Coordinates of C-alpha atoms and ligand atoms in Angstrom, one line a residue:
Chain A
X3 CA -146.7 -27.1 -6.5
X4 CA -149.7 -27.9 -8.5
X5 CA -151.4 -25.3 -10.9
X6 CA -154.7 -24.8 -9.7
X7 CA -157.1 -22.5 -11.3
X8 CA -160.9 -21.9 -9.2
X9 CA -162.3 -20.4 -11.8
X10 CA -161.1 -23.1 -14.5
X11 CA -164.3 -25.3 -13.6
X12 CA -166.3 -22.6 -13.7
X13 CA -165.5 -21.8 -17.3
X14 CA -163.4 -18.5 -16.5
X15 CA -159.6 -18.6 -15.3
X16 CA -157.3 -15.9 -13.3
X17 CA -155.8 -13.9 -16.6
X18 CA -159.4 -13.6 -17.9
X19 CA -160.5 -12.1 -14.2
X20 CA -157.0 -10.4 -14.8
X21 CA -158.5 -8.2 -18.0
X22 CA -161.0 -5.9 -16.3
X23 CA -159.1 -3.7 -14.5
X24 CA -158.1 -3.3 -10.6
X25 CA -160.9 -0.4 -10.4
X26 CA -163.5 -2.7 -12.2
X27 CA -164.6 -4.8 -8.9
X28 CA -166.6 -3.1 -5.8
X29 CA -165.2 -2.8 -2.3
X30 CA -164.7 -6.3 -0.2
X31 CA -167.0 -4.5 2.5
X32 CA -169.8 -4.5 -0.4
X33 CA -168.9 -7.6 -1.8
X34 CA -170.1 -9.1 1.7
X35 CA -173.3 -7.2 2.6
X36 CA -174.7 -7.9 -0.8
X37 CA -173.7 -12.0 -0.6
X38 CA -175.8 -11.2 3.0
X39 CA -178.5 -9.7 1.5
X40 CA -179.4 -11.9 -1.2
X41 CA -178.0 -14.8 -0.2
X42 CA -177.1 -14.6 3.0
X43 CA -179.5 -17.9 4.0
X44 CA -178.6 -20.2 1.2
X45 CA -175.0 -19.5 2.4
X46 CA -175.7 -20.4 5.9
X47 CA -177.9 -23.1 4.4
X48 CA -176.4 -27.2 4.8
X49 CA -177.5 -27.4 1.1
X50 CA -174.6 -27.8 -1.6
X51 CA -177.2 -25.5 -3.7
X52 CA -174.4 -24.7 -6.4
X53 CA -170.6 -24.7 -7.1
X54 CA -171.1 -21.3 -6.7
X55 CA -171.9 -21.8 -3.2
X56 CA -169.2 -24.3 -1.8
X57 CA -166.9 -21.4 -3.1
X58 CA -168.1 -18.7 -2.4
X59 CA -168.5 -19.9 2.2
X60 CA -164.9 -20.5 1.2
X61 CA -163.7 -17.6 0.3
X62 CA -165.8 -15.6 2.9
X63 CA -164.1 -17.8 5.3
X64 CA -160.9 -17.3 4.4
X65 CA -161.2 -13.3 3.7
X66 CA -162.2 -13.5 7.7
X67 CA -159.0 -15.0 8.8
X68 CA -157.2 -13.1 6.8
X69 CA -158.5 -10.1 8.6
X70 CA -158.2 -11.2 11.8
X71 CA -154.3 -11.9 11.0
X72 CA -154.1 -8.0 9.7
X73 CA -155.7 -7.3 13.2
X74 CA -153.5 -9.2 14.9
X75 CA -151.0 -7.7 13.2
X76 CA -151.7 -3.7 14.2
X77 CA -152.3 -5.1 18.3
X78 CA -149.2 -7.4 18.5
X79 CA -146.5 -5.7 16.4
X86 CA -148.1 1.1 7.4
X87 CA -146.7 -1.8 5.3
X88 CA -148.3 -5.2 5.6
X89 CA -151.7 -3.2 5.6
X90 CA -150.9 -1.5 2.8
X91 CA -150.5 -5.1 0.8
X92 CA -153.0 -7.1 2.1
X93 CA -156.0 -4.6 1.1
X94 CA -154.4 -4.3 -2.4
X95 CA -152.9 -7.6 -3.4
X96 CA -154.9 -10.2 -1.5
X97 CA -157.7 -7.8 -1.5
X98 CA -157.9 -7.5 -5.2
X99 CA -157.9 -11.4 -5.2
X100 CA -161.0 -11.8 -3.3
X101 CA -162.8 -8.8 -4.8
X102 CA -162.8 -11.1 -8.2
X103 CA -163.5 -14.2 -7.1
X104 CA -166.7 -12.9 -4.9
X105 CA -167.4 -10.4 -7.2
X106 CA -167.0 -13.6 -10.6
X107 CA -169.6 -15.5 -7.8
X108 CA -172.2 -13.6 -6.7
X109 CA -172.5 -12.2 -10.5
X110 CA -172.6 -15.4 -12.0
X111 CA -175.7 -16.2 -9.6
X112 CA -177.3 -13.0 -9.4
X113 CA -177.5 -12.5 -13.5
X114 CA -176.2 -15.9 -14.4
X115 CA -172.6 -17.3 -15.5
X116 CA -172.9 -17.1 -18.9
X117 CA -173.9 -13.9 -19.1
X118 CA -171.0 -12.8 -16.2
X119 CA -168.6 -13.9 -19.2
X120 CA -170.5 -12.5 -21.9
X121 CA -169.9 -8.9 -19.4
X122 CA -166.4 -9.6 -19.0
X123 CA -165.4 -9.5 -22.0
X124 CA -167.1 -6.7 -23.5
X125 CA -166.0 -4.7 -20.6
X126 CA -162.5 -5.5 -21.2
X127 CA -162.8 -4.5 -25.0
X128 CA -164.9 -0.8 -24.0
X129 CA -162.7 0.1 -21.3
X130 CA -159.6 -0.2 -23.7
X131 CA -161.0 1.5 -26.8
X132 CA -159.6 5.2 -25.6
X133 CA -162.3 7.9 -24.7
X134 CA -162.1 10.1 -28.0
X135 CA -163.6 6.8 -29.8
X136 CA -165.2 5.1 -27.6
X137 CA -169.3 5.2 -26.8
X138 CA -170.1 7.0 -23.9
X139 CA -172.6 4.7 -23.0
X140 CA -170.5 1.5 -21.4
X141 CA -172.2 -2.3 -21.7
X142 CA -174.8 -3.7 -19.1
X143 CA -175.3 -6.3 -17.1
X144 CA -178.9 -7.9 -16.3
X145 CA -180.9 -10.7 -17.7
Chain B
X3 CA -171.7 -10.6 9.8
X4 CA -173.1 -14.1 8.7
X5 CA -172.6 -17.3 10.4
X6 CA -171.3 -20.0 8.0
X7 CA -169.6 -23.2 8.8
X8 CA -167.8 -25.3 5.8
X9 CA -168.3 -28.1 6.8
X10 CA -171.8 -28.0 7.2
X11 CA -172.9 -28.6 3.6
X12 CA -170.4 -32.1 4.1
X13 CA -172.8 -33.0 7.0
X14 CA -169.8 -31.7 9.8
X15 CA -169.5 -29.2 12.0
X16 CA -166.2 -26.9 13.3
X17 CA -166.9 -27.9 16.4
X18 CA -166.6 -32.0 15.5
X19 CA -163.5 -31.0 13.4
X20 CA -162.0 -29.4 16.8
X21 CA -163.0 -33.0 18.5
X22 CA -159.7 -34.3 17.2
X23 CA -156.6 -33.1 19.3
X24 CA -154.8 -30.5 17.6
X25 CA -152.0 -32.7 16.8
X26 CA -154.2 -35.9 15.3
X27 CA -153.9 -34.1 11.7
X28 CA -150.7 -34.5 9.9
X29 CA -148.7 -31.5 8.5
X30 CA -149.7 -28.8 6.3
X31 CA -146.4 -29.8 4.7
X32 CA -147.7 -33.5 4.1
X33 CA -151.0 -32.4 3.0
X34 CA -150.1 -30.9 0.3
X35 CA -148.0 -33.4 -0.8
X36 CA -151.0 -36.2 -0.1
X37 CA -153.7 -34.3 -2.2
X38 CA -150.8 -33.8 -5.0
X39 CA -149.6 -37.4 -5.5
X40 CA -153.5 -38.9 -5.1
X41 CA -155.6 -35.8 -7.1
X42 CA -152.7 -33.5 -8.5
X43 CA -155.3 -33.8 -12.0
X44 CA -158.7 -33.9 -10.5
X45 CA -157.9 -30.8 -9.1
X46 CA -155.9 -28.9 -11.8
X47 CA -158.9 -30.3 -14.2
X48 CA -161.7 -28.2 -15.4
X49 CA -164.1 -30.3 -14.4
X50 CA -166.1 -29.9 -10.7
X51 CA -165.9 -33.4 -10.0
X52 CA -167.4 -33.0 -6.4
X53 CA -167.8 -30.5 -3.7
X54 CA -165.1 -31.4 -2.1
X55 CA -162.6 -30.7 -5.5
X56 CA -164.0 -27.0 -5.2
X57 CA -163.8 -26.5 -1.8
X58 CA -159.8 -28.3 -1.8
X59 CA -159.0 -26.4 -4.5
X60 CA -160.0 -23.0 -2.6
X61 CA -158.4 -24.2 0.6
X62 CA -154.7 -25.0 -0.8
X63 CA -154.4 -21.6 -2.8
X64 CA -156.0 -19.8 0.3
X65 CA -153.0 -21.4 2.0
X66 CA -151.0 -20.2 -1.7
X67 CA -151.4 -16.8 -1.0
X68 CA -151.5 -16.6 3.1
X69 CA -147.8 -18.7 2.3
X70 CA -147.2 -15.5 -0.1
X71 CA -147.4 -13.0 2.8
X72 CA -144.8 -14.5 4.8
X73 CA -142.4 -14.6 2.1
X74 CA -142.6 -10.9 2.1
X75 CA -143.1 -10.1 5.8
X76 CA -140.2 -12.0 7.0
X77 CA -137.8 -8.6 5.9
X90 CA -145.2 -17.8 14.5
X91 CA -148.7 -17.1 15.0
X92 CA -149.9 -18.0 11.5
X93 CA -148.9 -21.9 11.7
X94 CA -150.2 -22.2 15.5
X95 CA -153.6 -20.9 15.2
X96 CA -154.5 -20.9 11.6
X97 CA -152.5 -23.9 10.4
X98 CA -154.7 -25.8 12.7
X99 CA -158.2 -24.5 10.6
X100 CA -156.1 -25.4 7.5
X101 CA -154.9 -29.0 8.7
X102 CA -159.0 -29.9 9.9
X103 CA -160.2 -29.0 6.7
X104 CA -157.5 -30.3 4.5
X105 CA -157.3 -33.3 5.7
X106 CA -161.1 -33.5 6.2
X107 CA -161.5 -33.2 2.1
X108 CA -158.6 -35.7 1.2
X109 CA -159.6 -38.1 4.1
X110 CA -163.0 -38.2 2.3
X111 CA -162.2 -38.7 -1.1
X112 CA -159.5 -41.4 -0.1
X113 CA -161.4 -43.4 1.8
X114 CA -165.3 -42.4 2.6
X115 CA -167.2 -39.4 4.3
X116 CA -169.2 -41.2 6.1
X117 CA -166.4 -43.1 6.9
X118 CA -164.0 -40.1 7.8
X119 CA -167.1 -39.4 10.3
X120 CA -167.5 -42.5 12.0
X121 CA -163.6 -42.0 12.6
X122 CA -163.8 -38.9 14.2
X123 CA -166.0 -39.6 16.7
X124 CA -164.4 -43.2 17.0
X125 CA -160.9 -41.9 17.6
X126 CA -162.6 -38.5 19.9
X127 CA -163.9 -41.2 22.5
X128 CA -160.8 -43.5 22.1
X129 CA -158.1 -40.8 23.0
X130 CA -160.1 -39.7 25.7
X131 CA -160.3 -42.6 27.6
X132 CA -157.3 -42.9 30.1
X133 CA -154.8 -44.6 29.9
X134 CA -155.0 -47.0 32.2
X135 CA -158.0 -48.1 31.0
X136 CA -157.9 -47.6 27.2
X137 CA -157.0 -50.4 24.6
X138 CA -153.0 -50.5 22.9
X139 CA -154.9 -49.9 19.4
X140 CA -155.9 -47.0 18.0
X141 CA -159.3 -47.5 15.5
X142 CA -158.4 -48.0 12.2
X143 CA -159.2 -45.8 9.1
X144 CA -159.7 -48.0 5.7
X145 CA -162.5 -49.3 3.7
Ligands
LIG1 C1 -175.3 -4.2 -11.3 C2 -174.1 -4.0 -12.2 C3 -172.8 -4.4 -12.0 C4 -172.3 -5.0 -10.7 O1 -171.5 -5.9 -10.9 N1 -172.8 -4.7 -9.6 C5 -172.4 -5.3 -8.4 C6 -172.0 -4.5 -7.3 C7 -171.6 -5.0 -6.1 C8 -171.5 -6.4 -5.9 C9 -171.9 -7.2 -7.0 C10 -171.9 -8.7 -6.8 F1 -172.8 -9.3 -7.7 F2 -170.6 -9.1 -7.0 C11 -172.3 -6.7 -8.2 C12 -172.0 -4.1 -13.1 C13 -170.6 -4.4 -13.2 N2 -172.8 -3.6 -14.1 C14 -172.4 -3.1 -15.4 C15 -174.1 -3.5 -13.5 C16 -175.3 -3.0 -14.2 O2 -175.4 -3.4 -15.4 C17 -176.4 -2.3 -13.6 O3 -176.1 -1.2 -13.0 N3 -177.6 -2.9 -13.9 C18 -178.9 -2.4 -13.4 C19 -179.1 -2.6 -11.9 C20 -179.3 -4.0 -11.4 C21 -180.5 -4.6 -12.2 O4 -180.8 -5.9 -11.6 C22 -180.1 -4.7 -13.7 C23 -179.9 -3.3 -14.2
LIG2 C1 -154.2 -43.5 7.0 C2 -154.7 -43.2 8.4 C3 -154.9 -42.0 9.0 C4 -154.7 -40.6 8.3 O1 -155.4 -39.7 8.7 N1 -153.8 -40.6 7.4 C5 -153.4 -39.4 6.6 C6 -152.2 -38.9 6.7 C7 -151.8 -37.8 5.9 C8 -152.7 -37.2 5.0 C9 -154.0 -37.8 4.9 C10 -155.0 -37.2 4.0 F1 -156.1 -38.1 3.7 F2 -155.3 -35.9 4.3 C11 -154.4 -38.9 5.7 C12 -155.4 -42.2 10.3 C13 -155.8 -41.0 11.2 N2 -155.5 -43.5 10.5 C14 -156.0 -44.1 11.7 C15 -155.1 -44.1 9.4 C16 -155.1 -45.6 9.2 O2 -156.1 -46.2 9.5 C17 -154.0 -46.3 8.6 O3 -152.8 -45.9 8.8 N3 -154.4 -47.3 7.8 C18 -153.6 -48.3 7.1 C19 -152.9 -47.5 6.0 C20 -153.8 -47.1 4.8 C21 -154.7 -48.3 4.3 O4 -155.6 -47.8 3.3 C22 -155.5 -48.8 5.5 C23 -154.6 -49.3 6.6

C-alpha cells in the first residue's frame, strides 16, 4: 500500500477528524441536500473552483456507488447494512461534513471548531460550560 | 439528486471514458501498482499538487475501503460493474500525469475510431500513446 491521507493537503488528517466524536457529524442524507442547496451548481459546474470541490464530486460519487452496491445487495442476496451505514458511513459523514464546512465558514476556522469541540465535549458535564463553541464567520 | 460528472472539470465526460472497450484499461491490480511506483510521494505529500493528485488520492482509498468490505463479506459483481468506473478513472488520472491530458484525449478518441474499424479493413498498429 501507500499511506494516503485526503485531508493531509488540506491541512487536517483522519485521527484529527477521528477526535470529534461519531455523534458529532449530521446524517449523510443532510450532508447531501445541503452540498445541493448551496452548492449544488458549482458542483455540477466544469470549473476546478477549489480543492474542496474536486473532492468533495468525488466523494458524492463514490457514496452513490456505494449505495447502489447495498441495494444490490438486499434485491440479489441485517449484516452488511448494518456496517456500511456505520463504518463507511461515518467515513463519508467527515469528509463531506470537513468540506462543505471548510467552504461554507472557511477552513481555517473549520479547524479552529474542531478542536475546541474536541476539548468541550471531553471536559465532563459537572465542569464544563453549558454553552458549547460556535461556528460562523 | 445532482448530476455530476468527474471528469468534467478535466474537460471529459463518462460517456467518452465508456468510448474505450471495457477491456482497453489495464487492472485495478496494476493500477495501483503504476500510480505507486511513478507518484507513491506526490500523493502521500501534503501538498495539492494538481487536481488530479486530489481526485487520485480519493479514488484509490474509495477503492481502500470498498476492498475493506469484501474482506469482511466473504464469511463477483463489485469487480464487473464497478471495477470498470474505477479502472476509467484511475487510469484516466495516471494516464495524464504520465504523459499529457490533452494527450490522453486525443488517444481516446484516436484508439475509439481505430478499434472500431473492422478488421478487414483496419491497419496491424494500434495508435501509439507517448510524448
Ligand atoms: C451550523 C453549525 C454547525 C454545522 O456543522 N452545521 C452543519 C449541518 C449539516 C451540514 C453541514 C455541512 F456544512 F457539512 C454543517 C456546527 C457543528 N455548529 C457548531 C454550527 C453553528 O455554530 C451554528 O448553529 N451556527 C449558526 C447557524 C448558521 C449561521 O450561518 C451561523 C450561526
Ligand atoms: C503505455 C501505453 C498505454 C497505457 O495505457 N499504458 C498503461 C498501463 C497501465 C497503467 C497505465 C497508467 F497510466 F494508468 C498506463 C496505451 C493504451 N498505449 C497505446 C500505450 C503506449 O503507447 C505504449 O505502450 N507506449 C510505449 C511505452 C511507453 C513509452 O513512454 C512510449 C512508448
Amino acid at each position: 500500500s501507500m499511506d494516503i491521507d485526503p485531508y493531509k493537503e488540506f491541512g487536517a488528517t483522519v485521527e484529527l477528524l477521528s477526535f470529534l466524536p461519531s455523534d458529532f457529524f449530521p446524517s449523510v442524507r443532510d450532508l447531501l441536500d445541503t452540498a445541493a442547496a448551496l452548492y449544488r451548481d458549482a458542483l455540477e459546474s466544469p470549473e476546478h473552483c477549489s480543492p474542496h470541490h474536486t473532492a468533495l464530486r468525488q466523494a458524492i460519487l463514490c457514496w452513490g456507488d456505494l449505495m447502489t452496491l447495498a441495494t444490490w445487495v438486499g434485491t440479489n442476496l441485517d449484516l452488511v447494512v448494518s456496517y456500511v451505514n456505520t463504518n463507511v458511513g461515518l467515513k463519508f459523514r467527515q469528509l463531506l461534513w470537513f468540506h462543505i464546512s471548510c467552504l461554507t465558514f472557511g477552513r481555517e476556522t473549520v479547524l479552529e471548531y474542531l478542536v475546541s469541540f474536541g476539548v468541550w465535549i471531553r471536559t465532563p458535564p459537572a465542569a464544563r460550560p453549558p454553552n458549547a463553541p460556535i461556528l460562523s464567520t
